[PDB]
Amino acid sequence: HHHMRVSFMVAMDENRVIGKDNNLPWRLPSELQYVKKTTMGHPLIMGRKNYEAIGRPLPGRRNIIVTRNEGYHVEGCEVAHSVEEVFELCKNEEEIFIFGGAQIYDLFLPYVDKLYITKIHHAFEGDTFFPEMDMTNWKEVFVEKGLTDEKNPYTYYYHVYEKQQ
Template identity: 35%
Template sequence: MKLVSVAALADDNVIGIDGELPWPSIPEDKRQYRERIANDPVILGRKTFESMLDDLPGSAQIVLSRSEREFDTDTAHHARSVEEAVEIAESLGAETAYVIGGAGIYDLFQPHLDRMVLSRVPGEYEGDTYYPEWDEDEWELESETEYDRFTLQEWVRSDE
């Protein structure tokens, strides 16, 4: 199974402030993001899950949380670790699971990722949440597509 991180980040790796995006909404980015993850399970933290309850992403949500949780959503599953989250995704028959945040979840999964799909929003923004740094020697930029207000980059882990 492939683990793919999906995030929108500014030039300084800022991804959020007070639980919101730090830049004005970019509908085209939201659309491509939602389409990409629609048919596969997503892995996310509890706060991110709770912030998306009105419009849950993915075919199933694997919520990483240290505390035992029950969810009022049939598609939500609780996981206590990276390994358990991967086991749950595999038990759902997934070929791909998307890691969609928040910052702590991105950080936990960074060493395990096969790919990163990053919407790069130009500029620097005030924020309190950051996408983790990564060693570019371990990654290869596979594609880069320019859009009106962002650039979509697809990174694959190098085979070295």
Template identity: 35%
Template sequence: MITMIAAAAENDALGKDNDLVWHLPDDFKRFKTLTTGHHIIMGRKTWESFPKPLPNRTHVVITRNTDYKAEGAVVVHSMEDALAFAKDDSNAFIIGGGEIYTIGLDFATHIELTRVHGEFEADAFFPKIDTTIWELQESVFHDIDDRHKFGFTYETWRKK
């Protein structure tokens, strides 16, 4: 399996200035649970947004810069190279950003999308999900509470 995992607003906003525009602790927990023990494939800007590598995951960074070095990660120069590196993983995860998600749509078999209820100003966006190609398998709503300023829905999509 190749799974894209993201949190995107109703207007497909992912983030602004290389950061998320919301804080959803339960979504972070879900991300950790799903990705721990797996390869996580990301673009350079996503990698650089981390204060340090995430524990118990193999980081694969895609960049066009052939001189780029990323301590704690494997650097590759295409999605094909990233997936070849992760070929023995039962479920590699594509974790962003916007350009990497757009490229990843052609390769992914599943999408784990946290749909944040609201519209946000952003400079990175999740690609539109084409429902002629993708089928919604599960949808679980999470309301606003004392730890979550925004409601959201976990959506699991599978390529038809």
């Protein structure tokens, strides 16, 4: 029924960890730079918790915050309360990026068409996870090694998967 491409944007470790104590467990500026380039000009869909850890709208993109709170407001951001409201808000969009965290990934999981996933080759201590996915009907359409250096201290790969349908 929806016509925008629903894409996931996530970074995770070898045990699917995405978060620790409501924060990112790793510092990877180069990964962030890849994320900004890929998502620029497209809506970001993020969970209330995810957003408040940032505290500020990300420029050049519609920032849409998903919460059950019907009186929740933040300047420079739009607020949705469900999958369907997000779909209404993004009716005419080309592609939207589901941007985390876990609760919001779970929420949008039945509708994902494309998966932009960074895989970090390290086992972090974590408390928040990227949900399991059945990859049957999914094709890897892009893979490349991320930049490892003194500013980016882990090995990691950018992966993109597309659903076949």
